[PDB]
Amino acid sequence: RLTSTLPAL
Amino acid sequence: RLTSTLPAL
Amino acid sequence: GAMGSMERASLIQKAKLAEQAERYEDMAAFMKGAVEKGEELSCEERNLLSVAYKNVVGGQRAAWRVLSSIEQKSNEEGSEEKGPEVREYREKVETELQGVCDTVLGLLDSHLIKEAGDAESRVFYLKMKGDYYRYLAEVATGDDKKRIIDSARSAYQEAMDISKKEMPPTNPIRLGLALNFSVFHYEIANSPEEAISLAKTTFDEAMADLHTLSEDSYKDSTLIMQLLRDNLTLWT
Amino acid sequence: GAMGSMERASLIQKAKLAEQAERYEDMAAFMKGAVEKGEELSCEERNLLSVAYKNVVGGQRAAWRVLSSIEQKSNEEGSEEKGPEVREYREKVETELQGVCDTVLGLLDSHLIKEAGDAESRVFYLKMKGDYYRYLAEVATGDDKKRIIDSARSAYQEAMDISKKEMPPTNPIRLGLALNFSVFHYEIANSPEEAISLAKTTFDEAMADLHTLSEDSYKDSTLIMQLLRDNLTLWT
Ligand SMILES: [Mg+2]
Ligand SMILES: [Mg+2]
Ligand SMILES: [Mg+2]
Ligand SMILES: [Mg+2]
Ligand SMILES: [Mg+2]
Ligand SMILES: [Mg+2]
């Protein structure tokens, strides 16, 4: 999984 | 914590 | 609830301790307890709630993906039959993940969203609603998958409409909402052109508003703009 | 137990899946279920048991140390009183940690150790017994702290006696036992000279036995010798 969402781990 | 034991995480 | 006898302030204090200890299941249970006291959440408290459940559900999503990959491998051609165990355990993790999503959605529905009047809180909670329907959608395969997807879309859309009316284009909440809605379009709605368009337009409109910001807000906003750009680089 | 209706082989298969998914609480519950089937454990199964509980208790130990540090900070001079919450939550984590240690010790006592006749299994389980009494000792402050420490020492000592009689000095089980017993001496028994002596003698005797090993066993043994050296560098 390369997409970025928020909040991040 | 710098000491090493086994198994390690 | 098991947190019913603890003071609201102590639940918040222990949620912050659990975060420092990286005990995110504890952190989530503390913040669930705080929400169930029935008072609205401050900005800091809303972010504690989001961080706690994001870390819990993030572990479950990572685990589900590992198990789903193994399960698909076992259903390939020439793959030796190994029994029901892989499916069973993927289903166990999936059910626990859905339970966490239902818990968050239940908190938003009873009664965080209906009490949230300010744009910053209302957009925050509607984004959360979209996020946790999106995580449900990631594992959905049945008759209500379309309805789950539309519940994510509807929540994101109401959040977007409010954020565009009430917040500047650099507002971190607005930016993070658009980031996540763009990934919804790409990953869930099979609309990569919508995803790219949303991310580019969001980035460009924030860029043009940076001049209005203090050094600290500039750093807050550019951090999330970089995530928009990271996705655009992935996608184009 | 909740695993009573699942086949032993399926519990082992799911423990391995949980490891791949980094779901160590699940992994531990699966291996507890496998142990409670009542059959002895193979070498691979013993290592699944150890890996599962080590990861669970390792998360709790890291969390307890964070919370203990905060608690000591709050008990310093000029430190503002913040109520019982830090102590309460440290106690919550500590109790959960002790519960995990008691669970492992209960599995060893009912009935893994009494059925283990071969040196490789008997030394493995006695090392585990020493390890989990050591984790209890790390948080112990009451009247039975000395007895907890002596239970760790006694288990380690029986394991050492068997390992020296029945195993070569490069045996990874023997090496890992001596590594951990040496840290017991340094950290728990306040005997750093014993710790250093044990680590040096263990390292030197393994060094002189390396010539007997295959390339794969050489790599297995030197990996643990390096941990002995790492501790010696820390301590001298
Ligand atoms: Mg009160
Ligand atoms: Mg299962
Ligand atoms: Mg195109
Ligand atoms: Mg059977
Ligand atoms: Mg507590
Ligand atoms: Mg000396």
CA-nearest of C199, C219, C122, C114 to C166 is C122
Burial class of residue D38 in the structure, from the number of CB atoms within 10 Å of its CB (0-12 exposed, 13-18 middle, 19+ buried)? exposed
Using CA atoms, how far residue C224 sits from C126, D171, D226, in Å, is 19, 52, 43
Q: Which two tokens stand for residue D177?
A: 């036992």
Resolution in A: 1.9
For chains C and D, having 3+ Cβ pairs within 8 Å is answered yes
The chains in contact with chain B, meaning 3 or more Cβ pairs closer than 8 Å, are D
The answer to whether D171 and D210 are in contact (CB under 8 A) is: no
For chains B and A, having 3+ Cβ pairs within 8 Å is answered no
Cis amide linkage into residue D185, ω under 30° from 0: no
The answer to whether C11 and C31 are in contact (CB under 8 A) is: yes
CB contact (8 A) between residue B6 and residue D227: yes
Compare CB distances from D231 to B4, B8, B9 and report the shortest one's residue.
B4
Check the CA dihedral C201-C207-C210-C212 and report its sign.
negative
CB contact (8 A) between residue A7 and residue C54: yes
Which ligand places an atom closest to the C-alpha of D93? 5
Cα C222 to chain centroid, rounded: 20
Q: Torsion over CA of D227, D159, D147 and D199, rounded to 10 degrees?
A: -30
Instruction: Report the C-alpha gap between C9 and C12 in whole angstroms.
Output: 5
Q: Which residues of D touch C83 (CB under 8 A)?
A: 10, 13
Q: Which two tokens stand for residue D78?
A: 């000029």
Using CA atoms, how far residue D188 sits from B6, D131, D183, in Å, is 16, 11, 8
Which of C 158-187 lie inside 8 A of A, CB atoms?
176, 179-180, 183, 186-187
Instruction: Report the C-alpha gap between D2 and D18 in whole angstroms.
Output: 17
Size of chain B, expressed as the number of residues it contains: 9
Using CA atoms, how far residue D1 sits from C17, C86, D142, in Å, is 33, 21, 31
Inter-helix orientation angle C192-207/C215-235, to 10°: 150
Contacts of D63 (CB under 8 A, 6+ apart): C21, C22, C23, D93
Contacts of D228 (CB under 8 A, 6+ apart): D175, D178, D179, D182, D199, D202, D203
Which ligand places an atom closest to the C-alpha of D197? 6
How many Å from the N-terminal Cα to the C-terminal Cα in chain B? 13
Compare CB distances from A6 to C59, C176, C186 and report the shortest one's residue.
C176
From the CB of residue C114, how many other CB atoms can be counted at a distance below 10 Å? Answer: 11
Closest Cα in chain B to D134:
B5
Instruction: Report the C-alpha gap between C62 and D60 in whole angstroms.
Output: 21
Which ligand places an atom closest to the C-alpha of D11? 2
Query: Token pair 């006291």 is at which residue?
Result: C37
Using CA atoms, how far residue D44 sits from D40, D122, D134, D139, D216, in Å, is 12, 14, 24, 30, 17
The answer to whether C28 and C56 are in contact (CB under 8 A) is: yes
**SS3 of D144, please?**
coil
Using CA atoms, how far residue D16 sits from D34, D60, D125, in Å, is 12, 22, 20
The answer to whether C75 and C90 are in contact (CB under 8 A) is: no
C214 backbone φψ class: left, alpha, beta (φ>0; ψ -120 to 50): beta
Cα D220 to chain centroid, rounded: 19
CA-nearest of D75, D101, D145, D156 to D123 is D156
Instruction: Report the C-alpha gap between C113 and C124 in whole angstroms.
Output: 9
The answer to whether C236 and C196 are in contact (CB under 8 A) is: yes
**SS3 of D1, please?**
coil
Backbone angles phi, psi at C190, to 5 degrees: 55, 40
Using CA atoms, how far residue C5 sits from D72, D129, D207, in Å, is 26, 38, 60
Contacts of D7 (CB under 8 A, 6+ apart): none
CB contact (8 A) between residue B5 and residue D179: yes
Using a CB cutoff of 5 Å, list residues around ligand 2, an ion.
Answer: C 88-89, 92
The answer to whether D176 and D224 are in contact (CB under 8 A) is: yes
Compare CB distances from B2 to D55, D58, D234 and report the shortest one's residue.
D234
Long-range own/partner contacts, residues D147-151 (CB < 8 A, 24 or more apart): D149/D188, D149/D189
CB contact (8 A) between residue D62 and residue C20: no
Q: Which residue blocks in chain C are alpha helix, DSSP H?
A: 8-20, 24-35, 43-74, 85-107, 113-115, 119-139, 145-166, 172-187, 192-207, 215-235
The answer to whether C156 and C162 are in contact (CB under 8 A) is: no
CA distance D22 to chain C (A): 7
Instruction: Report the C-alpha gap between D101 and D133 in whole angstroms.
Output: 7
Instruction: Report the C-alpha gap between D28 and D64 in whole angstroms.
Output: 20
3-state helix, strand, coil in chain A (%, to 5): 0, 0, 100
Q: Which two tokens stand for residue D30?
A: 């699966």
All structural domains of chain D: 8-235 (1.20.190.20)
Size of chain C, expressed as the number of residues it contains: 236
Instruction: Report the C-alpha gap between C142 and C136 in whole angstroms.
Output: 11
